[PDB]
Structure 1
């Protein structure tokens, strides 16, 4: 398939490229969430006419994401309370949901797609480093606390 990128894709290229992409990749991933559009001549000319204002919105979105990363890094006041047992054993688990609830109560309605965790899900009491991906290049680090209430 010939498709026109709408965004910075990891391996395809930058905003605007006629790349020969596989049909499944374009149909199921690139097109549904706005990242690419088919290489129809109508779309090609329509994209080449208005192209200049796309990088403007892209740059302002990237700047906003960079600002969000600094904001959530500076917040760093995250606490989750759950009834846990002795020996630092957490009965249940603190998940991305609880993390998103705490960062919602702290900052601005942070969703649960950007939040990232290692293979483990912090099943023990302690302070853990939580990863956030506001953008494709944004790497944010958050400190959390858990209470065995």
Structure 2
């Protein structure tokens, strides 16, 4: 899947970068636990337009 990260991941990236992962990785680990969101156009717009400042605010 194409996903947008919600946090730091060692080999993927961090804090809003769009990166393609294997479908099982996104479906079973990241998305259910909130570490990323599927990179739909609506999801990307909703993430970047508003919420991103607080997402950056949480350092740890």
- Which of structure 1's runs of 4+ aligned residues deviate more than 2 A? none
Q: Does 1:4 align with 2:4?
A: yes
Q: What TM-score, normalized to structure 1?
A: 0.38
State the 1:5 CA deviation.
0.3
Which ranges of structure 1 fall in alignment gaps of 5 or more residues? 63-149
Question: What's the RMSD between the two structures over aligned residues?
Answer: 0.8
3-state SS in 2 of match to 1:43: helix
Structure having the higher helix fraction is: 2
Unaligned runs of 5+ in 2: none
TM-score by length of 2: 0.90
Q: How many residues align?
A: 59
Q: Deviations over 1:98-143 (max 9, x none)?
A: xxxxxxxxxxxxxxxxxxxxxxxxxxxxxxxxxxxxxxxxxxxxxx
Note the C-alpha offset of 1:36: 0.3
Structure 2 counterparts to residues 1-149 of structure 1, below 5 A: 1-50=1-50, 51-56=52-57, 58-59=58-59, 62=60
Shift of residue 53, structure 1, vs aligned partner: 1.6
3-state SS in 2 of match to 1:32:
helix
Structure with higher Rg: it is 1
